[PDB]
Specification:
The PDB classes it as replication. Keywords: DNA Replication, DNA Replication Initiation, Replisome, donson, Replication. The entry is titled "Cryo-EM structure of CMG helicase bound to TIM-1/TIPN-1 and homodimeric DNSN-1 on fork DNA (Caenorhabditis elegans)". Chains A, D are DNA replication licensing factor mcm-6. The structure is cut from a larger assembly and holds two copies of chain A, two copies of chain B, one copy of chain C and one copy of chain E. Chain B is an alpha+beta fold. In chain B, 15% of the residues lie in helices and 32% in strands. The two termini of chain B are 55 Å apart. In chain C, the strands form two sheets. In chain C, strands 3-4-5-6-8-7 form a six-stranded mixed β-sheet, with helices on both faces. In chain C, strands 1-2 form a two-stranded antiparallel ribbon. In chain C, a hairpin with a 7-residue loop joins strand 1 and strand 2. The longest helix of chain C is centred in the middle third of the chain and has 32 residues. Chain E is α/β, with parallel strands linked by helices. Helices cover 38% and strands 23% of the residues of chain E. A five-stranded mixed beta barrel of chain E has the order 3-7-8-10-9. Chain E has a five-stranded parallel β-sheet with strand order 14-15-18-13-19. In chain E, strand 16 and strand 17 form a beta hairpin. At the D-F interface, strand 1, helix 1 and helix 2 of D face helix 1 of F. Strand 9 of chain B pairs parallel with strand 1 of chain F, so a sheet runs across the interface. The structure holds phosphoaminophosphonic acid-adenylate ester, magnesium ion and zinc ion (2 copies). One zinc ion binds next to loops of chain E. Chain A binds one DNA strand through strand 6.
Chain lengths: 208, 244, 287, 82, 541, 114
Amino acid sequence: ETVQPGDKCDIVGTLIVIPDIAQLSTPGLRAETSNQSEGITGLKALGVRDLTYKMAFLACHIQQTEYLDLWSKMSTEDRATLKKMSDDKKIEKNIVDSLFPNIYGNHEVKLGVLLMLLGGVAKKSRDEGTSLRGDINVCLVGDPSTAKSQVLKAVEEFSPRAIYTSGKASSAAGLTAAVVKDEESFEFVIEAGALMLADNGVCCIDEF
Amino acid sequence: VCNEIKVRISQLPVEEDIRMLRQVHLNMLIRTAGVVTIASGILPQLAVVKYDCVACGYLLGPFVQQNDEEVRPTICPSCQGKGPFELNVENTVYHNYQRITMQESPNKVAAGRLPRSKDVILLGDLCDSCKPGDEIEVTGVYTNNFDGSLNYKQGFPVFNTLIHANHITNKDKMASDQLTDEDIKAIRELSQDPNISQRVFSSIAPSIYGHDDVKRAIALALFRGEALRGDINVLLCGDPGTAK
Amino acid sequence: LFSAMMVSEYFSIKTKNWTQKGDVNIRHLLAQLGITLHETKQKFEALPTEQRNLVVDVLEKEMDSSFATFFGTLGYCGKLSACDVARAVTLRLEMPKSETIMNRFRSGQSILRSSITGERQDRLNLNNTFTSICQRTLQVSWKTVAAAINQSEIIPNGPYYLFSCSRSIDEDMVDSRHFLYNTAGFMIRAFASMKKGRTTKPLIAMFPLTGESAGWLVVTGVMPIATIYEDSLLKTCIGRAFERVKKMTPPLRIVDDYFNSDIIRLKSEDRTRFIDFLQTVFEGTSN
Amino acid sequence: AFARCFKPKISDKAAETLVREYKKLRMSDSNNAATSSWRITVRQLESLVRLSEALARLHCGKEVLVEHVEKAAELLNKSIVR
Amino acid sequence: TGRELIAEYRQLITQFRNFIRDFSTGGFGMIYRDQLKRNYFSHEYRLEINLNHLKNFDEDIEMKLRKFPGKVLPALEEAAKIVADEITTPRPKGEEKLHDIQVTLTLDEYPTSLRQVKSAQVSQVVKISGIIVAAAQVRSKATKVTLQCRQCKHTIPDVSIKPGLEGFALPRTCAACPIDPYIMLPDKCECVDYQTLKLQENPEDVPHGEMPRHLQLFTERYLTDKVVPGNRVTIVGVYSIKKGIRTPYLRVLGIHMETFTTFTPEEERMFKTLAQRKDAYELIAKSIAPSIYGSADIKKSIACLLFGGARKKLPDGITRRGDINVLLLGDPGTAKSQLLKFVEQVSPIGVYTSGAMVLADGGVVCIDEFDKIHEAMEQQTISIAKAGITTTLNSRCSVLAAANSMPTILSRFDMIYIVKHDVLKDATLAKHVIEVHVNASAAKETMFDTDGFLTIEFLKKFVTYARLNCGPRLTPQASEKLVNHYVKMRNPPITVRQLEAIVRIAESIAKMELQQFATDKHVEEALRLFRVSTIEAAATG
Amino acid sequence: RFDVLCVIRDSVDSVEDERLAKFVVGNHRTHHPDADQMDERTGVRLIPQDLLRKYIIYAREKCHPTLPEQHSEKFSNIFAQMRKESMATGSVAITVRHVESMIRLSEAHAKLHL
DNA sequence: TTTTTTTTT
Ligand SMILES: Nc1ncnc2c1ncn2[C@@H]1O[C@H](COP(=O)(O)OP(=O)(O)NP(=O)(O)O)[C@@H](O)[C@H]1O
Ligand SMILES: [Mg+2]
Ligand SMILES: [Zn+2]
Ligand SMILES: [Zn+2]
C-alpha cells in the first residue's frame, strides 16, 4: 500500500512464471474445476488435466519516478532561489510568459489559469459537517483557431496530476469513477477514473 | 432471566484504520471506525449441539460449536461402536447472529485513494444495533482462517480475515426526547409570558432578516392541526440567491 | 400485573408515577422485590401455578394488609372472586345514565346470575364486562387525579380545599357513587403526600356536566386525613354541611334528590355564593 | 508546489474592501439590468474570495490584503463585461 | 430403551382420551365429544381444542404439549381417532373405513412481537399476529412411502415422513446392491395437500422510520386455501428452523381471522313499495349525493346511467347496446370528484381513476381529468397489432367522464353538460357549506335516512335487483312520437346515434318504476333531458 | 395540497447587500481551520434552540385545543367576502379548502399558547 | 458490470 492509482513508477525485481494452480489435486485440496493452447501432461496430481502458465513480475522495490520545517529542510539552493522569486515584483508576468511561451496576447486567460493552478483555502464547518469549496473552475468559449486546445494541452503538460480528455471519446464510467468485477477474484471493485486520478489536480475536457 | 453476564470493553486507547491492518494484529484486540453499508437479517445459529445414537439411544455431547466446523461424533462410547447419528431437537441450543459490512469514512481518505472495507460479525444482544449509513466505532478481535477457493482466486496461499465484534458505539444515535421537571418548569414559565407568539416567530432563524410571513408560516407549521389532514403544508418560491 | 399495579392507589403513591420518575421507580421496585418484567407484562393466566403462588406471596407481603375473601368454583371452569364480581355488578348497575333505570337493574341481575354457571356464553359476557369497563373506570379515575396534581387544580379556600375542572374526562362516569367516592378519596391522599401539613382540612370537589345537563355541577366531599375514629364506624359530616348550606336565605339552585346526602347538584351560576355559604358553615362550626 | 502549503487569513481592511467591491458589482449590474449578459448573485462573492486567496498564495502572503481583493475584482469585471 | 418411550406414549394417549371424553360445562354438555360427532357425520375429519380448557383439566400435559409439540401432538391426534371410532360404531354398510383426524388449537394470550421471538423458543409453540402478503398454489406432500431395491427387488413398506419442510434420507445399502440402491414407487404412496404463505408484521408495530419484516408459513390439509393476500390474522404454530446457519419458518397449527344476488320477501316488498310510489324517480335523483347542492338534471342523468337500457340480440346476430355514457365539462371545481366517488360507492361494480378500461364487465367506470378508445366506447372492445402480438380485449360497461376543458369522441357520449355567476346565491351556499364544515368540526370534537333520502345500502341492493329483473320495451304510441320529432328536427347534426340514445334513456326511466312497457311520459322526459343536456354544446363553443 | 404559498423576490439594495456580505465574509473568516440576545426589529428576547425544540415536543403531545361554535360567524362572513371579491374580480376562486386551512391555523395558534 | 449495433415504438 505504498502506491496509488494514476502513479507512474520504477520497479526493480525479477520476472517469474506462475501456474494454473486450480488443475492440481493433493492432500488438503481438490481441484476447483472438478468442484465446479495445450498444456503440460504427466504429473501424479494431474490425472487427466493439464497445466499452463502466466507471466508476472515479483517486485523487489517500487517508487514513483519523480510547512516551516520543510522550508528549513530545503535549505541552501531552494530557499535562495524561491526567496528571490518571492521578492520578484513582476513574478505574475515572469511566470505566465514562461508557462505559455508559444501564445500571443490573452493576458486575462493566462492569469486566470495560473490562479486556477493555485486555488483557494478549503474550510469545514466545525460541527455541521458542511464545507466551503476552495476549488476554482474556468471555461473557455471562442471562435475556431483561438488556441483553446493549445492552452489545455499546455496545462496538462505542466501540472503534476493533470489529465486531458475529449468529450467525444469519453463515457460517464471512464470520466470520474467506475464499477468493475474481477475474474481472478469474482467480487465487485472500483476503478478510479480520470477525475479521481486528478483528485487535488486539474481535469481538462476538450470539446465539452 | 439469564445464564451469563457478558463484559463489554470500551475506550481502548489505540485506533487503527481498516487500510492499515497487517499480519501483526492477528489475534490481537483492536478498535476501528467507519460507515455501515450492508447488513444481513437476524438468523439463529447453532451454539451447543447434542446427538442421538441410533444404535442404542444414548445422547452424545455436549459439543460447543466452533466457528467454522461441522462438529460430529464418530463413535458412541456406550456401545463402543460407530452407530448412526441424528440431531437432538430437544437439547440443541441456538443464539442470534448477524453479519455487516463496514467501509472507511469518506472524510478520512487521502488524495485520490479508494476506501477499504471489512466484514463484522455480531452475536447475541449486539444484533440489530445499527443501520446502513450509520457512523459507528467497533472494538473486537482481528483473526484469520484458510479458504481454498480464495487461494484458487488469488493464485497464492492467502487467508481470509475478519473482526469479531465486542463493543460498538453508534455516533449517529439521536438524543432522547424525554423532559425533566426542570425542562417542564421552564416550558410553563415561557408559556406564561404575553409576548410568547412574537418571541417564537421572530426567534425562528434569527440570522435571516425580515420575511416574517415565511417565519410565521414555518412556526405555525411546526405545530400541527388536531385532525381529515392535520398537517399544514407550505411552499416557497423565490429567485436564486434569496436564501430560500 | 404491571397494568394492575400502575392504576392502584398504593403503588401510585409509593412510586409517585404522576411525575416523570415513575417508570424508573417501579422498575427499581420490581428489581428489589425479585420479579421479572416479562412475568409482570404477560397475561396473569399464562404463568405456571408455582410461579403464580411465589409472585402472589411476594406482593402480599409487600402490601402488608389483612384482606381475605370468598372464592367460588364450579366444575372445570375458572375460579372467581367475590370482589371482582362485585365490581362488575356495580358498574353494570350505575352506568350509563342515558339508559333507563329498569334496564340497568336487569343488566346487573343478568351479570350476577352469570357468576354461578359454567355456560360458555354467560362466562363470555362476564369476561367482556371485566375487560372493558372495569379497566376503563380505573384508568379514567387515575387520569383525573394525575391531571389534578400536575396542573395544580386543588387550592386552599379557608377552612377547606377546593377542586374544579375545566372539563370532565367522561360524563357517563361522573354521576356514579363508586366513581365519585373512589376518585375523591384517592385525590386527597395523593395531594397530601406531596408536601407536609396538608392533613387537617377536608376536600371539596366539583365536576361539570354538558349536553342535556349543561349548566350544572356535581358536588361531593371527603373528611380530613388526620381524623380519629373512636371505633370502626367511619362517621362523616360533609353531607350534613351541604344540607345546612341549603337552608340559607336567599335560596340557591341546589338539587338534593339522592339517597346519599354528600352528593348534590348545583347550578353553575350559584358557584360563588355556594363557596361563600359553605365557608360560612365551616367557619361557624370552627367557632 | 511550495506556495500551496500556505493558508492565508482575511484581514480587516480586506473584509471592508470585499463588501465595497460586491456593492460596486451589483450596482453596475442593476444600472445595466436589461442589457448585461450575465446576472450577479451571492455566488460571485464566493468566487471573489477564492480569487483573493489564490492571489495571496501566489505572492506567498500569510494574509489577504486590499490589493488582492482589488485585482480579483478587476479580473472578474474584465471577464464579465460583454 | 424403546419400551419406556412406548409406556410414555400410551400414557399420553390414555390422558388425552380422558380429556376428550370427560370435559364438560355442566349438565350433559360434553362439548368436544359432541363437536367430534357432528364433524364426523358432516364428513369433516378435524377437531379444535382450547388450551386453557386443557390447562384447567390437567396442567402437566398442556405444559408438555407446549414445550415438546413434535413429540406430544401425534398422541393427541391418535386419541381423537380412537374416540371417534368409539362414538360412531356400528357404522352403516359401505362406511367401515376409519378416517384420520386433524387436531387444531386455540390459545388466549397476548401475541409475541415478530421482532422479539427469542432463540430459546425454537421448537416451541408460539402465537404471532400479522398480515398475509402472498399465497402460493396448493401442492402435494407424501405422508407414507414404499421403497424397493433396484437390483434384488426387496421392499420396505410404509416408511413414514415427519411433517413440515423436512426431507428424509433413504437407506444407504440393502437390508436383505450398490450405493444408494432404493427407489420410490409412484403408485403406492399416500399424499396430502400443503401450502406456503408469507406473513408481514403489522404496520402499527413497525418502529419509526424502518421497513417491516417477514416470516414464512407452512399449512396443511384443512388449513389450506383459508386465506387471501391482505387478510389480518393471528396464528398459533411451532417455531422451526428449515433444513451452522439456518432460516426460520412457522408450521401452522391454528388460524384466526380478524375480520348480494339473494333477497328476502321483506326486501322484495320494500323494493315494490318504492316502485309503487309516484315520486320514486324524483326521490332517487334527490337521493344521489345529498351533500352537494343543486345539479338536479345532472343527478337525474346519473340515475339513468346507473340503471341503463335493455340489451338486445336479433336473429341475424347483430347486438344492440344497453349502456349509457355521460360527460361533464367546465370549471375544475364544484365537487366533480366527489360525485364520481359517490357513483363508485353506490354502483354494484365500479372503478374510479384519472388497462383500466377493461376491468368492469357489467359495471361502471368513473374517469376524472379526461383531458389527458373510440373502439372501446362503441364496439365494447379494443384491438392491437404491433410487433409480435395481436389480441382483442372485450368488456361491457358504462362510463362517466369529467373534463376540465376532441370533437371526434363527443359522438360517443350520450349526454353532455357544461357546468359554468353565483355570488349572491353562493352567499347562502357559503353559509350552508361552512355550517356543515363547522358541524363536522363539532363531530370531530333501513330504507330512509333521517332526512328522508334513501340509504346507500338500500339503493345499491335495489339497483342490483332491478337490473336482473325488469327488461322493458316501448309501446307503439311511444314509438310514433319519435319519428315526427326526428323528421322535424332534420328538415326544419341529427343522427341515428342520437335517436337510439333517446330510446335507451326512455327504457332506463321505465326501468326504475319496474314497468313492463315505456310510454309517452317516459319518452317526453327523455326528450327533455336530451335537449337540456345536448343543446348546451350546440350553443357553447 | 399546500395551505400556504410564499414568494421570495430578489431586489438590489445597499443595506441588505451589506448585511449579507458581512455575514458571509464572517462565515469564511471564522471557519478558517486555524482561526441574553434580542431581535433588532422588536427588542424581543430569543429562545434557546434546544428549549424551543422541547417546547414543540411538549406542545405536540400534551395539548389538544377545542373549538367552540361561535367562531363560525367570523370565518363564514370573511369567506363569503373573500370569495365574492375574487369571483367578481374574475380570478382564481377561494374555496372550502381555505376554510379548512383557516381552522388548522387557528388550532395551531392555540397550541402555541398551550 | 459496460459497450456497440440494428429493429421497433
Ligand atoms: N494567439 C495566438 N498565438 C499563436 N498561435 C495562435 C494564436 N491563436 C491561434 N493560434 C494558432 O491557431 C492554430 C489552432 O490552434 P487551436 O488550439 O486548435 O485553437 P482552437 O480554437 O482550439 N481550434 P478549434 O479546436 O478548431 O476551435 C494553431 O496553429 C495556433 O498556433
Ligand atoms: Mg482546438
Ligand atoms: Zn451407541
Ligand atoms: Zn438389494
